[PDB]
A paper describes a structure:
Here, we solved four structures of cryptophyte PSI-CAC complexes purified from Rhodomonas salina (Rs) cells grown at L- and S-phase. We then solved four structures of PSI-CAC complexes purified from cells in both growth phases, containing either 14 or 11 CACs, and termed them as PSI-14CACL-phase and PSI-11CACL-phase for L-phase models, and PSI-14CACS-phase and PSI-11CACS-phase for S-phase models. Comparison of the four structures reveals how cryptophytes adjust their PSI antennae in response to the different growth state.
Consistent with the trimeric organization of CACs, both PSI-11CAC structures lack one CAC trimer, but at distinct positions. Accordingly, PsaO is untraceable in the PSI-11CACL-phase structure, and chain-s is absent in our PSI-11CACS-phase structure. We thus superposed our PSI-11CACL-phase structure onto the PSI part in PpPBS-PSII-PSI-LHC structure, generating a hypothetical RsPSII-PSI-CAC model. Our hypothetic RsPSII-PSI-CAC model showed that the arrangement pattern of PsaQ and the PSII lumenal subunit PsbQ’ is almost symmetrical. When cryptophytes enter the S-phase, changes of physiological conditions inside the chloroplast, such as lumen pH values, may weaken interactions between PsaQ and PsaB/CAC-i, resulting in the detachment of PsaQ and the reorganization of the antennae of both photosystems. It is likely that PSI-11CACL-phase constitutes the preferential form for the potential RsPE545-PSII-PSI-CAC megacomplex formation, whereas other populations of PSI-CAC complexes simultaneously exist in the chloroplast, where they may facilitate the dynamic regulation of light harvesting of PSI under different physiological conditions. The micrographs were collected using SerialEM v3.6/3.6.1 data collection software on 300 kV Titan Krios (FEI) microscope equipped with K2 direct electron detector (Gatan) (for PSI-14CACL-phase, PSI-11CACS-phase and PSI-14CACS-phase) and 200 kV Talos Arctica (FEI) equipped with K2 direct electron detector (Gatan) (for PSI-11CACL-phase).
Author numbering:
A (entry chain F): 28 to 188
B (entry chain J): 1 to 42
C (entry chain D): 3 to 141
D (entry chain A): 11 to 189, 192 to 754
E (entry chain C): 2 to 81
F (entry chain E): 2 to 61
G (entry chain L): 2 to 152
The structure:
């Protein structure tokens, strides 16, 4: 398929991975009696292993010659659920954390003693700020354009060189 | 509840440990109910 | 003014931290002070000695060793009567501290400023400017 | 009655107000942070009580209540070990089959595939195999039930609550005055007689009435649920007299001094129990009874309130001769007014005792079925070597803190301290020479052997097959200890330990203990030990003796115990403090203890541990390769680290895969430490300046200005990660190796 | 020897002279600062280079500036 | 400038170069650095105040 | 009774008079030793020290050397001792050249001429002592063995 890879649902090496992974657990299950707590635990592990391989086979992942799933991250939309979409979820959460922390340090600067607000956090105000993060791309872009994100170069301390 | 005990629970290490334990706790719970999420399913 | 070599010394049971061959071949330092009491102090070179009531004389290998005892004698026993000398192997005695009878921390007339630069430190010349010329980097 | 209890009532108010103001305990930190250094300076000086307060009374009160908090933590920890033994263990399965079931008291949750760590330890059980030797302790105690482990967990929980209450009570409600703490005679009388003496007496009583009947029934072959409960031995004296017929006469032989009646249960057998490979518990019961008598007798030495006894001041001031001036005068004043002097002594002793514990516990295995549980033997040796080495370096740490802070020359004129400081150049130069001599003549023998073996000259090596450096004195002492039963210990039946010579003790076809022969390789590695111990002493002693002043810095005491340097002048005075000799000596302690545990691990696997074949042949774990390969460094690299690291590297996908992960993680942490060790603060502060610029550009600069860590803290962080990384690497390597092969 | 310089931003606080373990610095009269005094270094041959004077300096950039130079027996702190 | 005003530092070797401090006092004598500026941020030395000249200080 | 006193009745000197440092036995031994012996020429000082050092150098090279098991062990040991003597005499020569400024007086080791005389004596003594050890070990079978000839 893509990059000479094979879909995991029809690769024989993924199937032998699943079969070997289940044989390892079945030989551990072969030393226990049916209703015992270790046997029940081992059987649930076998069920989880089968579910993982069954889900991966039908997911559109591409396996290598080694039978392990490979991620295609060049931007193609048939594989966007492996990096582009998880990455968009990350950048939303990361920008949330960044916007929320930036808003709290700007609040803490306007305090009576700014450095106590950073070792003893004003938790109601900081929770107001953690609620602010859900619309950070718009809040931060309006902040950027309204001249409130970027400070001018002549307001920043720099070394003599 | 005492205001000095609440000001103690607002200290940086307590909030850091509680928030990262809560964070760790929902990563653990999300990987318990919905394990093996190598990809966003689509 | 000159060091009276006959000044009695503090009671020290000796130590291995004292001066070595460079004291008798390069320079030795001496410190004298007057004590109102027969009191124990700590040697810069080791353990404890007892300074005698009256005038004491010490022989150290470093000027910092002398000034360390001087601070111990001024902060714990309040002696301000310490004179630090550098004694050459030739026998020349050079008075050092306090150099003009007044402590360096107090202003004194007739002191000429050495090392004083008329501008602030950010106005020092860059090394490229002073390269391949004898001109100094302090302007 | 000059020894009296005196307490201030309600000294400190139990309020949460100071909890809410971090840094309250010092004048510097209480005004709040302005840089991030404050944050680090908060944790660094918190337990430094004598840096906060001038008064010895408030310092002593803080120490007493912090010791109760530590005891509360230890009791909570013990209660958890008993609860995990009761609830998450195969202890009952292990009791039935101690030689096949592997001890396990930790079960993991199935979350991210980590349930592979619940390996098949045996007894119809899955869990993490535990190597702390608790199962062998509990069998030695005679627990034989998980219900009794729940009762021990509750007893630990009650003690943990009582200690945390006592710390609160003795700091906030009834805090003793300084004159209470300055009763060294009373404290020694009570800690010898009461703590150690009634501790041994009560433990000997428990052993006689509980451990001895239950373990006789266990070794007879009785199943654990067929064994009478431990109080049925207390009441049914007839049933107790079946196992030990001396109980038919009761306590009349004790009081009438007819003690040879009690030889059924108070023996002097020596050697090991053939069934368990552990010490005879009748010997252990007699051992603890004899220690109890001497400890109680010892605790009557000192004078408290009735004229009988010694004044320790009189003992010390009378011991003075012609070489030592005023002698031990002034040492009593030191040790009852300086907590650091006491901590220096007690940490050096507790570390020495922990080191003694590791040697004696492997050689004379004290618990049933602990000798043939090789993961436990390796774990508790390695653990008590590390606790010993750390505590010994903390003894030198607090010797340095005493010298910098609590030492007063006025009260220490011409005594033993004055004389040591007044010949410290002779001490450090002779120690320096012995360390150079002993690095040349121990490690240079290894370099000679590497060179000769690499050059094809096997006849030119120091080896058993070539030039033989035999340990004649150690072999001779081994001869004496093998000849001692019936000769110089006539009433002993067996040797103190089979390590000296004698039989091979096998339990479940695995060697419990067997003679440890010493050859050229053992001579070489013992002189490696003498060298690494000497150099650690040199760094720690050089730091203690030069803590206050040097020829380099004549006023080092004014800079403190822990300062980074006194500038780049005098050539450079980097790491001139006593703290920096503790810092440098903890590396050499690490080096010393790492070679000791490597010597132990290789020697026990190569020459002691293994399986007993038919005809009594012992196939050892690494097949006797120590003798001809521990003489070269390439042998230690190849036949010890490379050969035995096979289990950690190949542990993935098994229950020991956590050890492979910790092996790699600790290699990471160790390397990560070298970022803090090889670098300096000025680089990181200028890098932080550029990062601060990037924050300023986005108006996200913090109000607590970020700083690079202090020079001392960069050293401390580097050392802490280095020790964690190295020890964790050895911990993972040792544990995966010996769980797989032993 | 080391070279020790005092710049005209010196406020005459006398702290660098007090810090000096080797009597390198002393105070001379100067009308530039409110205190009427500036530090001077007429004894840089005794300077060990410890830079304790720099630590004691409360000016944003140390008015006292030690520049480590040629080493001698005195500037190396050698008691031998 | 005048006492109490907020000022921007133009001394390139200052810790607080192009940062804002506030003027505490200004001497009237022949002092080389009369403007005493106090700053919220502390320097690496821990000092939070320094004396500057007029041509090194601009009102904001 | 105190057995340790300040050295030379000077407390601040960097030494302590101790039984090991300042007993009459220690003073007698040092004075008796050729390096500190009064009335001894620098050349004669070198001859006595050299005879001693060359004599005992042969034995470790002979007994523990690479050619120890060979029948040429003594010749190899002597040559190795002799080579070490030549390296050491070069060390003595170079130390003398750099340490001591040329002065007319030769009556002391700490003079250019005196150290040259000492080095001359040390070479003659060391080669002679090494030779004496070679002659003795070759003649005596017991010396050829490690003391196991009786066994
Ligand atoms: C002291 C030694 C010790 C140790 C090392 C352990 C270790 C463990 N126990 Mg055991 N346990 C102990 C004592 C101990 N226990 C005792 C004394 C009891 C009796 C009460 C138990 C009873 C017990 C049970 C019943 C179970 C365990 C389990 C476990 C495992 C997981 C626990 C867990 O994830 O909690 C995580 C729980 C949380 C709530 C998360 C903690 C996050 C918070 C924020 C902690 C922060 C502390 C706080 C910040 C401190 C400041 C206070 C505040 C005022 C500022 C782990 C192996 C489990 C196990 O083995 O399963 C197989 C299990 O089921 N333990
Ligand atoms: C015989 C009486 C006695 C006993 C048993 C102890 C025991 C102890 N003292 Mg000492 N102490 C005593 C008298 C005694 N003290 C006196 C008279 C003084 C005044 C001079 C002091 C002053 C003193 C100081 C200043 C300090 C101690 C500390 C300690 C603890 C050491 C840590 C340890 O190993 O605990 C673990 C061992 C244990 C056995 C834990 C058990 C805890 C209890 C208290 C033991 C006794 C229980 C009870 C008597 C037993 C009843 C038996 C019953 C079931 C039949 C330990 C609990 C140090 C400490 O840690 O402070 C807390 C400490 O700093 N003590
Ligand atoms: C380092 C080189 C590089 C870079 C930066 C990119 C970057 C990108 N690729 Mg390309 N790609 C590359 C190499 C590279 N690719 C290579 C070597 C291959 C193998 C032939 C591909 C094959 C590939 C395919 C087949 C596709 C991409 C697409 C994309 C885009 C992803 C989503 C996006 O923004 O669409 C724009 C969407 C938005 C701006 C908003 C959507 C919400 C992105 C511009 C996808 C695309 O959109 O093509 C333009 C697409 O279909 N890439
Ligand atoms: C920055 C690097 C990085 C990245 C991108 C990921 C990404 C991921 N990890 Mg990995 N991981 C990392 C570092 C990283 N991890 C580290 C450092 C460790 C060691 C502590 C692990 C150990 C680890 C394990 C053991 C597991 C993951 C899992 C996951 C998945 C999380 C999806 C999820 O929570 O669904 C949760 C469900 C939702 C609905 C949300 C995702 C593929 C899990 C997984 O799915 O594996 C494929 C899993 O089981 N990670
Ligand atoms: C970080 C501290 C630390 C930790 C976590 C451990 C952890 C462990 N130790 Mg070790 N230990 C340490 C420090 C530590 N040790 C030190 C400093 C010493 C020297 C005193 C010892 C001496 C020691 C011995 C002698 C034994 C252990 C044992 C154990 C294990 C069971 C725990 C238990 O219930 O002990 C319970 C302890 C016992 C059942 C025996 C106690 C016998 C000692 C002699 C009691 C002395 C008490 C007395 C108050 C000490 C005063 C000090 C003295 C110098 C005045 C466990 C692996 C046991 C073990 O390895 O079994 C497999 C064991 O027999 N420890
Ligand atoms: C602190 C530890 C401790 C404690 C609490 C006890 C407690 C007890 N012991 Mg034990 N005992 C101990 C240490 C201890 N002992 C030690 C160290 C030894 C060795 C010398 C013994 C040897 C011993 C024997 C041999 C016997 C007891 C007996 C008893 C019981 C006394 C009944 C009686 O007077 O009959 C005494 C009978 C007479 C005829 C008098 C009592 C439960 C007796 C008992 O009932 O055994 C279960 C008994 O026969 N003890
Ligand atoms: C009975 C033992 C004992 C006691 C009571 C003390 C008590 C004290 N020591 Mg001493 N010390 C000890 C043992 C002890 N130490 C040992 C064994 C060592 C050798 C390592 C030292 C080395 C030492 C030095 C070098 C110094 C002290 C200092 C201090 C004082 C304050 C320390 C502080 O606030 O730290 C607060 C506690 C911490 C900052 C904890 C951090 C330590 C490590 C990094 C944490 C370990 C984490 C864990 C074990 C492993 C990580 C696991 C990871 C995977 C999560 C205090 C007087 C210092 C002082 O101020 O002198 C007066 C000082 O300079 N001690
Ligand atoms: C493997 C690396 C290594 C080596 C070889 C050394 C070597 C040494 N260290 Mg160092 N050290 C190291 C790592 C090392 N250290 C590390 C990582 C730390 C981290 C904190 C320290 C910290 C440290 C301190 C703090 C101290 C030492 C001390 C010593 C000396 C011990 C005395 C001795 O054995 O002399 C014998 C010399 C050796 C064993 C070096 C190996 C030489 C072998 C035997 C062959 C010789 C080759 C020969 C000269 C070839 C000549 C021909 C050739 C020149 C052409 C010695 C110079 C101590 C010291 O100097 O005081 C005595 C001391 O106090 N070390
Ligand atoms: C150790 C050998 C020994 O027996 O020392 C014993 C010797 C004993 O001296 P004193 O008889 O003066 O000891 C009297 C009291 O200090 C003893 O309580 O101590 C010394 O002379 C110092 C030795 C330092 C170590 C030298 C090496
Ligand atoms: C990296 C590094 C820094 C920079 C390191 C810093 C500023 C530490 C900051 C790390 C973050 C900010 C916190 C660390 C938290 C860790 C994830 C875990 C810490 C665990 C304890 C701190 C609780 C120094 O300051 C330094 C100073 C002297 C010698 C070497 C070095 C050095 O190597
Ligand atoms: S410290 Fe800085 S400011 Fe104070 S006097 Fe010395 S130089 Fe002038
Ligand atoms: S460096 Fe040390 S010595 Fe030289 S001047 Fe500054 S303080 Fe005085």
């Amino acid at each position: 398929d893509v990059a000479g890879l094979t879909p995991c649902g029809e690769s024989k090496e993924f199937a032998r991975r699943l079969d070997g992974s289940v044989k390892k657990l079945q030989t551990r299950l072969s030393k226990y009696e049916a209703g015992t707590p270790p046997a029940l635990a081992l059987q649930k592990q076998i069920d989880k292993t089968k579910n993982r391989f069954d889900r991966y086979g039908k997911a559109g992942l591409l396996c290598g010659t080694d039978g392990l799933p490979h991620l295609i991250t060049d931007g193609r939309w048939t594989h966007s659920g492996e990096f582009v979409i998880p990455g968009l979820l990350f950048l939303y959460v990361a920008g949330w954390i960044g916007w929320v922390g930036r808003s709290y340090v700007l609040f803490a600067r306007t305090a009576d003693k700014p450095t106590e607000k950073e070792i003893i956090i004003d938790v109601p105000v900081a929770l107001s700020f953690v609620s602010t993060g859900f619309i950070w791309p718009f809040s931060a872009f309006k902040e950027f354009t309204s001249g409130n994100l970027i400070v001018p170069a002549d307001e920043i301390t720099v070394s003599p060189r | 509840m005492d205001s000095n005990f609440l000001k103690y629970l607002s200290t940086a290490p307590v909030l850091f440990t509680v928030w990262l334990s809560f964070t760790a706790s929902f990563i653990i719970e999300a990987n318990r109910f919905f394990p093996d999420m190598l990809y966003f399913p689509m | 003014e000159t060091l009276n070599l006959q000044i009695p010394s503090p009671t020290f049971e000796g130590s291995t931290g004292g001066w070595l061959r460079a004291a008798e071949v390069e320079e030795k330092y001496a410190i004298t002070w007057t004590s109102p009491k027969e009191q124990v102090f700590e040697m810069p070179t080791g353990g404890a000695a007892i300074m005698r009531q009256g005038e004491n004389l010490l022989y150290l290998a470093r000027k910092e060793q002398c000034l360390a005892l001087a601070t111990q004698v001024k902060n714990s026993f309040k002696i301000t009567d310490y004179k630090v000398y550098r004694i050459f192997p030739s026998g020349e005695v050079q008075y050092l501290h306090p150099k003009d009878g007044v402590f360096p921390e107090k202003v004194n007339a007739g002191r000429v400023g050495v090392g004083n630069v008329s501008h602030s430190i950010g106005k020092n010349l860059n090394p490229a400017q002073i390269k391949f010329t004898s001109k100094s980097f302090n302007g | 009655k000059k020894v009296s209890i005196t307490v201030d009532r309600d000294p400190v108010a139990t309020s949460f107000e100071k909890w809410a103001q971090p840094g309250h305990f010092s004048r510097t930190l209480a005004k709040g942070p302005k840089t991030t250094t404050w944050i680090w300076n908060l944790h660094a000086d918190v337990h430094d009580f004598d840096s906060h307060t001038n008064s010895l009374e408030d310092i002593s009160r803080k120490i007493f209540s912090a010791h109760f908090g530590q005891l509360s933590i230890i009791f909570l920890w013990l209660s958890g070990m008993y609860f995990h033994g009761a609830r998450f263990s195969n202890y009952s399965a292990w009791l039935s089959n101690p030689t096949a079931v592997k001890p396990s008291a930790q079960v993991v949750w199935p979350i991210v595939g980590q349930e592979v760590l619940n390996g098949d330890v045996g007894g119809g059980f899955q869990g993490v195999q535990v190597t702390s030797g608790f199962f062998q302790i509990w069998r030695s105690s005679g627990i034989t039930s998980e219900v009794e482990l729940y009762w021990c967990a509750l007893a630990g929980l009650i003690m943990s609550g009582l200690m945390i209450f006592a710390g609160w009570f003795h700091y906030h409600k009834a805090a003793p005055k300084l004159e209470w703490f300055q009763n060294a005679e009373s404290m020694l009388n009570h800690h010898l007689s009461g703590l150690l003496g009634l501790g041994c007496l009560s433990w000997a009583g428990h052993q006689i009435h509980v451990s001895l009947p239950v373990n006789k029934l266990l070794d007879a072959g009785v199943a654990p649920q067929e064994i009478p409960l431990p109080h049925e031995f207390l009441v049914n004296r007839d049933l107790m007299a079946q196992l030990y017929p001396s109980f038919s006469k009761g306590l009349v032989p004790f009081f009438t001094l007819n003690w040879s009646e009690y030889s059924d249960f108070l023996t002097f057998k020596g050697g090991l129990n053939p069934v368990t490979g552990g010490l005879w518990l009748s010997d252990t019961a007699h051992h603890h009874l004899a220690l109890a008598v001497l400890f109680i007798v010892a605790g009557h030495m000192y004078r408290t309130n009735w004229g009988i006894g010694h004044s320790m001041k009189e003992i010390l001031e009378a011991h003075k001769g012609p070489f030592t001036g005023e002698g031990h005068k002034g040492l009593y004043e030191i040790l009852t007014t300086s907590w650091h002097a006491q901590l220096a002594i007690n940490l050096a002793m507790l570390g020495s005792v922990s080191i003694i514990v590791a040697h004696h516990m492997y050689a004379m295995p004290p618990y049933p079925y602990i000798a043939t549980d090789y993961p436990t033997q390796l774990s508790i040796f390695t653990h008590h070597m590390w606790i010993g080495g750390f505590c010994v370096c903390g003894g030198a740490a607090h010797a340095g803190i005493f010298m910098v802070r609590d030492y007063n020359p006025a009260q220490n004129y011409n005594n033993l301290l004055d004389r040591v400081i007044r010949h410290r150049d002779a001490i450090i130069s002779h120690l320096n020479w012995i360390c150079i001599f002993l690095g040349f003549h121990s490690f240079g023998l290894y370099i000679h052997n590497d060179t000769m073996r690499a050059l094809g000259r096997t006849q030119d090596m120091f080896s058993d097959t070539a030039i033989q450096l035999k340990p004649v004195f150690a072999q001779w002492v081994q001869s004496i200890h093998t000849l001692a039963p019936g000769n110089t210990t006539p009433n002993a039946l067996a040797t103190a330990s089979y390590a000296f010579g004698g039989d091979v003790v096998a339990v479940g076809n695995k060697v419990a203990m067997m003679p440890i022969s010493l050859g050229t390789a053992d001579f070489m590695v013992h002189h490696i030990h003498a060298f690494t111990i000497h150099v650690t002493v040199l760094i720690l002693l050089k730091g203690v003796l030069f803590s206050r002043n040097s020829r380099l810095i004549p006023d080092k005491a004014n800079l403190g115990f822990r300062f980074p340097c006194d500038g780049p002048g005098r050539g450079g005075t980097c790491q001139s403090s006593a703290w920096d000799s503790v810092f440098l000596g903890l590396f050499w302690m690490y080096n010393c203890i790492s070679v000791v545990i490597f010597h132990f691990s290789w020697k026990m696997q190569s020459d002691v541990w293994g399986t007993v074949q038919s005809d009594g042949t012992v196939t050892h774990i690494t097949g006797g390769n120590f003798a001809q390969s521990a003489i070269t460094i390439n042998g230690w690299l190849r036949d010890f680290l490379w050969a035995q690291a096979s289990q950690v590297i190949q542990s993935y996908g098994s229950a020991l895969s956590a050890y492979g992960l910790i092996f790699l993680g600790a290699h990471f942490i160790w390397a990560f430490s070298l970022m803090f060790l090889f670098s300096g603060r000025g680089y990181w502060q200028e890098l932080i300046e550029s990062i601060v610029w990037a924050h300023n550009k986005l108006n996200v600069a913090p109000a607590i200005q970020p700083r690079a860590l202090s020079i001392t803290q960069g050293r401390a962080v580097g050392l802490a990660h280095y020790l964690l990384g190295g020890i964790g690497t050895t911990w993972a390597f040792f544990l995966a190796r010996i769980i797989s092969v032993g | 020897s080391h070279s020790v310089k005092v710049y005209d931003t010196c406020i005459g606080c006398t702290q660098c002279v007090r810090a000096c373990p080797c009597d390198v610095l002393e105070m001379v009269s100067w009308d530039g600062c409110k205190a009427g005094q500036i530090a001077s270094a007429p004894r840089t041959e005794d300077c060990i280079g410890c830079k304790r004077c720099e630590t004691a300096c409360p000016t944003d950039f140390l008015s006292v500036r030690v520049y480590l130079g040629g080493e001698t027996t005195r500037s190396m702190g050698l008691a031998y | 400038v005048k006492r109490g005003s907020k000022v921007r530092i133009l001394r390139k070797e200052s810790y607080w170069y192009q940062d804002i401090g506030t003027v505490a006092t200004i001497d009237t004598s022949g002092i080389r650095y009369p403007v005493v500026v106090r700053f919220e941020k502390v320097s690496y030395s821990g000092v939070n105040t320094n004396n500057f000249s007029l041509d090194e200080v601009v009102e904001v | 009774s105190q057995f340790i006193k300040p050295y030379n009745d000077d407390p601040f000197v960097g030494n302590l008079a101790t039984p090991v440092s300042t007993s009459s036995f220690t003073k007698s031994l040092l004075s008796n030793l050729p390096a500190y012996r009064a009335g001894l020429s620098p050349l004669l000082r070198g001859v006595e020290i050299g005879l001693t050092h060359g004599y005992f150098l042969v034995g470790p090279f002979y007994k523990l050397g690479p050619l120890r098991n060979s029948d040429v062990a003594l010749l190899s040991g002597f040559f190795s001792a002799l080579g070490l003597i030549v390296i050491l005499v070069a060390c003595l020569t170079i130390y003398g050249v750099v340490s001591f400024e040329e002065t007319e007086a030769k009556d002391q080791l700490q003079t250019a001429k005196g150290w040259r005389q000492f080095t001359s004596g040390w070479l003659v003594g060391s080669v002679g002592g090494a030779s004496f050890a070679y002659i003795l070990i070759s003649n005596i079978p017991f010396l050829q063995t490690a003391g196991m000839s009786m066994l």
